[model samples]
Target: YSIEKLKKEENSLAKDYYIYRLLEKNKISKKDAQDLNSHIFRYIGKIKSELEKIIPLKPYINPKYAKCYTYTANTILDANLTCQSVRLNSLVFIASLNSKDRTTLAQTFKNQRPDLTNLLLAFNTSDPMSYIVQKEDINGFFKLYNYSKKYDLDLNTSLVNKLPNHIGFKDFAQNIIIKKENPKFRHSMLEINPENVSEDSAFYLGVNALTYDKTELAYDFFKKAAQSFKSQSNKDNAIFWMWLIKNNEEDLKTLSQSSSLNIYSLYAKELTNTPFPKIESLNPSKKKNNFNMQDPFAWQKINKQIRDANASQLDVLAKEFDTQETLPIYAYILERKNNFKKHYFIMPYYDNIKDYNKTRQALILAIARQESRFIPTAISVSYALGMMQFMPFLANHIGEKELKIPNFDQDFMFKPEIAYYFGNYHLNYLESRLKSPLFVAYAYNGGIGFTNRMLARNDMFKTGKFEPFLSMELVPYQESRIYGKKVLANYIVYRHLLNDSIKISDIFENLIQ
Candidate 1:
């Protein structure tokens, strides 16, 4: 049954084989006809083996056919095929299965791989008379079998003698026997009749159950498929187990604790209100601003002097706006215009605090300065607009009802009232999410989603005692890297301008509180 010969004929066998080939290549454009053809040709003998070979090909045969082929292959093959050959062939087949389309295959592969499974057990086909071939290389295959049996899969006596190599395998075997003897034990395994379950059928049932929130049932069916999973794609079933059984607060926490999880920690913190403890404690070693509050001269020198000098420069630049000689200064002033005092004005509510306290005023001004360079109408490429650059999604979520601003344009970010309100709301939201002022500041720049994904990725890379901010590599995006540093610099300058004796670290700690 060469593929070329099958391709030349128009009979039912030829059509079925062609469709199977198309499906293996993931080219299932006309599914109904192909499916009907496949069903009609099911009983054809060597055609089953041909379909199995075609199913694991990539751009992977249609996930539907891959599953069907898996079920059919297992069903038709007598147990006489060497277990090593069976296991290896299954691994090779599953390795090509699509992770997203055939998740069950992905899980099985992972569970059977040398890096994952701790034991080897006997290989079994659906047929009871299948004999173990003695000459097969049982390296990785043996270990996988032991692990399967440890999980309570029963095997013939011939395969049981190969178990003494590992203590874990022995312990696992004892546990399985104990489990089997205890009829009262609540089995996590499904009680479905294996004789009637084809891989394709099991896959459909698992998917339907999972979609409908019948998690326990789905777990059982997926597990059953996973037990005999020969392809790399079988590992996805194990992933499904994680998704179905362990995807709770504790699991999330465990993931968060992983180094890979650091990338997403900010978003996670925002959604969960649990601070990523490491990010909260990150302190950049460089110090840019230091000023004493006790001396009045220190206050006048930094604030009044700089403000007056910039004001005079602004006047000269304003008058020379149209002059050819002033082109350079015009550009300078345009840039400086973004930094003007008027652009630094606080909201009406913050005005009272600014009036009563110069330090508070300077700090607010510094944050605004860093955030938007006091540019009331500034818009970022990320679609964030306004003096504070509020994201539209964030704005709609927080102030939709109260602001009732309809058809709100990003260009209208110049409206100080709207900008101030949305900006403050976003800042407050980030603050609450991270439970740390520093992370919120970073989140404001990098986005909550980006932060959380990074956190998650970081957690996956490490095992114990994970630290976030202290570990710079955990952060995925370059923009976030610069943003964190810039915001901290602004905080330091703001504190200095206020004549406050506090360190930037102190401010960071205070914000987290």
Candidate 2:
């Protein structure tokens, strides 16, 4: 496509490709060409090498192609305009940039960039302690703190002291307290300014205060957080935590009847011995089965239709997919009603799953419930596809070795039976290493390596006052942290439904084992 045509159409990849050709034909400036080229990092296969030959790469490149660039103090000091990985990798090279003056590049880089959010760690000078104490970049310092610990580099004592006083350091402070790292980094540091504190920051402050055995401060923070939190689940969480700090029967009752069925609500209901409320279920009766479940493109069209469908349109679409195989579509329709209490849990493809034991069946249903709400054609933005949300690479491995499907098309995962089979096989593999449903959930969402790293930490899923409850909230990755809880809750509900009852409390208690 011509540059003008591609630009008008907003085809970035096409425009970048056209721009590269223009650069080759002496029709564009090197700087302009590189700017366009940088945006199309993923699609530029051989173009990256060709572009680099023409214009030696700038320090700042897209994270996708950042690994290809040679990171050094010189490259990074020119412009502090790269991904965190590049900034991090450049840290070691700073000391050796100039042997005569170690802090020359470090100080220069610091002065060059107005925002040192990613550059704090790279300043390896003995006197950068002054640098660490002055700035108010909380994220940068916290990250540098973690990076120091990871690499076993001894940071100046002043750096740790300054971190607590920095604005927007509430989350980091709370996490440090939760992890039991530095008792001196008190709740008062987070309480720097009451007026500017966010609801999330208040929540974190509450968690920190609670950790330090300050009941009144924690309760106040939780109250403030509960009042201001936008998400019902978060508000409920704040209330629940507040109730835990000091027993409140009214709060417990409120949580028990919460519309949002989260870990907090489930706990409250379980404690009260109240049977889980009945939720509205989709009609199971088969209609005109005219859908193509295995076709990703077809799924995409229907997905958009479902999203754009009005009340009456949705009602008609629900009836169209009322069959067992398309129950996920029916469930997705129910979700559009904004009814959080709706019965999205379903044992679709029962015949395929029936071969597994009751426990395994419940586990499969639990994972599928959370993964895609049992949607066979679900596609995550990260490209984790179909019912089980298997990434393409993992799907290929399972298809090749376990299932023995010679040549795999990822769209085939949209087949309910195959998704179940693949998911079951993968779960078996996961369970083989990590036995607990909670740990398996963590491993499933954020790979086994990540779960192992979490397990290695003393604070995670370990015996303590809060034990697994605190660990669950602080599971590093936000996706896996919340994902693990929801999946566990689903497991509890499904297991009880299958007559293999398990307590949420018991699960928490046994998390370490």
Off by over 4 Å in 1: 1-367, 396-399, 405-411, 453-470, 499-501, 507-513
lDDT for residue 329 in candidate 1, whole number 0-100: 25
Q: Residue-wise lDDT of candidate 1 within 1-513, one digit each (tens)?
A: 344444444434324534454554555444333433335334344434444443432454555344344433333223222332343445333333233322332234444553212111222222111222232223443444443332233333333333333344333322432223322111321333333343433443354344345667765655555455553233333333434354556534443343321223322333455543331111223332243322222332333333455666666544544233222223335445545211122222243244435543444444565566544444443435555666656665655565667776444454556665566556656656765445665677788887665545534223322223223322445466546645554554454445663444344334321
* Candidate 1 lDDT for residue 117: 20
- Residue 262 of model 1 has an lDDT of 22
Best model per TM-score: 2
lDDT of 2 by residue, 1-513 (tens): 354444453323324444455555666556555545435524444456656766766665777755535545455445444533345454444433554333343344465564442244436445342354456444555555554533222334444444445553665655565455555455334443333444777777777766666767778878888888888788888888878878888999998988887778888999999887565655576644877766554676677788888878888887777786677777788787555556556677789988788889888988988888777777665557778888767887888766789677665677788889998998998999989998999899899999998898876777776666767767777788888888887888788777788788887677864
Instruction: Evaluate model 2: give its TM-score.
Output: 0.69
Per-residue error (Å), model 2, residue 268? 0.8
Model 2: CA > 4 A from native? 1-196, 308-316, 323-325, 406-411
Residue 39 accuracy (lDDT) in model 1:
52
